[PDB]
């Protein structure tokens, strides 16, 4: 039966307006838990993908990485990286589905009136996604990954007005 | 005490350059002993903030503990911390000696690998967090994620495990 960190779904969102030089978000979604990692990058490149996944796979090495035919994932350099780590690459052909819809939508709404600030608020976006309940499942992505680290479970330890307000804004989009 | 209460941060390096990288930011969780490693090009406030933004996307730590390094005593880092709600404290305990031994072992591991330290960095982290330490009675990974993953076959990977195990278990 499927475990956390068994399978990753990866995608690039962007370009978004420049925000401290960043233009894209590498989205990583765990197959079993629904847990989302957001990595800001300057380009949707193999290079940025490898660096981000080297950080993530310092935790655990996935068996499978699934992605579309983006240039970052179909390169020989990305294929070589995966081969070295023993990871299989899966490519898409015509919980995880609705996860990526929600992120593009959340990041779009986040820009209104503060387009160059999405980079600063990205940690709060990830934090809200992983600590919000999904329709059919009984646990948050975070509960499922960490077993069922916060000093305050309501605010998720956020203290800054715009971040707390952001949490609220995201819960409203996810629950309504 | 819960995980993410207190982080201990520091830089190792400079190390022989590898595709531009020269430094490793070391973040150690006070309660679990879990270590996160991030390669950087400089021991800068900027690299530190980029790495910590990634980590604090998981949970916001109450306290970050560091030395007087330029990265950590800057006003930029003060502003970043105050905005996130994190108390910065600076050095002038079972938890303090554990973190010190992690740094010594890590330095030994990275310095001992002048041409490969960067490429092996994720393996350094995984092997360290998933090795039984007699001081913890668990692996750091178990203490973080809830109380085998080290089935690594490559020559450089077994060499890492062997060296960590020797350091921890030999009298």
From Swiss-Prot, chain A:
Mg(2+) 3 binds at residues 6, 68. It is found in: Virion; Host nucleus; Host cytoplasm. Residues 1-148 form the Integrase catalytic domain. This is Integrase. It comes from Human spumaretrovirus (SFVcpz(hu)). The chain holds residues 869 to 1055 of 1143 of the full protein.
